Design a protein around this ligand. Structure first.
Ligand SMILES: *C(=N)[C@H](C[C@@H]1CCNC1=O)NC(=O)[C@@H]1[C@@H]2[C@H](CN1C(=O)[C@@H](NC(=O)C(F)(F)F)C(C)(C)C)C2(C)C
Ligand SMILES: *C(=N)[C@H](C[C@@H]1CCNC1=O)NC(=O)[C@@H]1[C@@H]2[C@H](CN1C(=O)[C@@H](NC(=O)C(F)(F)F)C(C)(C)C)C2(C)C
Lengths: 305, 303
């Protein structure tokens, strides 16, 4: 038993991380097959970033301006392309450690593991969620660009995030692996802000199911409620509305604990109305919302890769 | 910027996880060179665990009783010995993925990454601290035995933990890689007690420095205190006493923020006495204590 914020094993992704140097700039790249993916502002000087013309900057660059190093090895670039906000550099060598992989674009509320990297070396791994405002509450210093987020399906690595920049209040923004930003953000050093963030309700319900499975039950109440009554309250407290699709996703957890989803919604309703009164749930004094219903099932059943 | 509970990359340890089968029982092993390490209760039946005599139970096992699978391929066991609470199985194949490694016994308050495994296959990775009562707060199901905790020093993997059992309160107990338990626990299915846990004060101060570095400053004050003043306060709240050595460990953080270790202690004392007034620090409503002063320096300066 117990319940922890848990990241996927990073081994498969570590084997794809490389260093990309263009000029003075040094950041991280993702080496899959004979293509290396990295953020396109690697071609930028600190002056360029205030308002870059990427198309102009890139055409001026030749293949030999891009240094790709995979540990001790040095990869020879034989092609460079730009797709949205990522540079694609073709290399003379296919990554022999390329795992089974997809490129996916996740919806808000879905979680993933981030492998934080600097100079192409993995530094650490942690778990995060795509916030409803399309930011992620991460941990990134200068030089972390190109660190990627991923999910693992048995042996297939679904890459969903590449890191680019930090927004006001210390939140983070980036792209899918096709270079399209999550949210209304641009890779320019200009005034941007994320927008009001909301709590991921279906994940809070999943986390409450993790608690019950682990013995924390003091919050279960005798009441119940309709889906529309719950959502009326939840939007009052800046919680995302619960949809019928969210109810079905919670089915497995509902059938394990014999607690109807709408019964659990009533417990949550009272938690937002009467506060937690200094009490804790699975050790936390706040309601946790970065566990998906799938995360909870995985951790409580022992799924492996 | 930002601050997260962060684990070491688990790749080097993934290549050392094998499945160990002995009769009906299955659990995880750690394959280093031509040796596999696993908890010794892999030799117990359902009944044996209530009161095992491991010497006698092992005497009735043979090398051919132990089936080690590494991915698909089965390994050949050619020798076995018992070192305290772990079995050491010699195999006919050195692990070609063996990293540079050492075995260490960690102190309370130190942190490490756990690679949680089932049937020799990794399930997930998370960070935890050795509690002062020599338990850890983990996530462990049946079959998780033989999962290991570890730190990475550049390229060397320091193994410090192998998981054995779960205690009544849902916390978890295990051994170092020589098989000596952390704490006063035994590998037997009988009611056991962890004892009173305390807060790792020097880690809480490290977390507060992480907060100040990340712009969350509302808890700072120009108040002061002595180490004896603070420690007299801290013990009332079940906080481990702060030593001068802890003050020396916190030095790099103090110098990076320009806040004396003891000014920060005066802020922690104020926090324990007055609560948080519903405030949060780094988005947390409670004081976090599983970040060491080294962890904070690493994450906030990018090692
Ligand atoms: C990658 N090398 C860094 C990683 C950043 C820096 C600090 N923390 C991180 O995650 N990325 C940047 O330096 C990018 C890079 C130019 C500016 N930038 C920023 O992250 C800046 N942010 C913004 O301009 C804002 F707020 F709009 F996001 C900075 C103020 C330096 C944090 C480019 C191309 C965006
Ligand atoms: C080995 N894979 C399991 C892992 C446990 C089971 C649930 N979570 C875990 O971390 N470990 C065991 O089953 C060990 C094994 C016999 C009993 N045991 C326990 O963990 C038991 N605990 C205790 O008896 C107590 F209270 F002392 F901790 C159990 C009640 C099954 C949790 C042996 C040899 C210790």
């Amino acid at each position: 038993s117990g319940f922890r914020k848990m990241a996927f094993p990073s081994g498969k992704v570590e084997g794809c991380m490389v260093q990309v140097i263009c000029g003075t700039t040094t950041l991280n790249g993702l080496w899959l097959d004979d293509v290396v993916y990295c953020p396109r502002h690697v071609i930028c000087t600190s002056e360029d970033m205030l308002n870059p013309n990427y198309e102009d900057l890139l055409i001026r660059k030749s293949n030999h301006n891009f240094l790709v190093q995979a540990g001790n090895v040095q990869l020879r670039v034989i092609g460079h392309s730009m797709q949205n906000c990522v540079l694609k550099l073709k290399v003379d060598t296919a990554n022999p450690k390329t795992p089974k992989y997809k490129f996916v674009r996740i919806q808000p509320g879905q979680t993933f593991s981030v492998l934080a990297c600097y100079n192409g070396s993995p530094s650490g791994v942690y778990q995060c969620a795509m916030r409803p405002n399309f930011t992620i509450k991460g941990s990134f210093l200068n030089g972390s660009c190109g660190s990627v987020g991923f999910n693992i399906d048995y042996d297939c690595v679904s890459f969903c995030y590449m890191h680019h920049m930090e927004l006001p209040t210390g939140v983070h923004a980036g792209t899918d692996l096709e270079g399209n930003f999550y949210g209304p953000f641009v890779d320019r050093q200009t005034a941007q802000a994320a927008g009001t963030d909301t709590t991921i309700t279906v994940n809070v319900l999943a986390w409450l199911y993790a608690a019950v499975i682990n013995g924390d039950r003091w919050f279960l109440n005798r009441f119940t409620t309709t889906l529309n009554d719950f959502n009326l309250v939840a939007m009052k407290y800046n919680y995302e509305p619960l949809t019928q699709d969210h109810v079905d996703i919670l089915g497995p957890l509902s059938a394990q604990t014999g607690i109807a989803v709408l019964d659990m919604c009533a417990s949550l309703k009272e938690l937002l109305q009467n506060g937690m009164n200094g009490r804790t749930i699975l050790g936390s004094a706040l309601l946790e919302d970065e566990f998906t219903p799938f995360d909870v099932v995985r951790q409580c059943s022992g799924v492996t890769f």
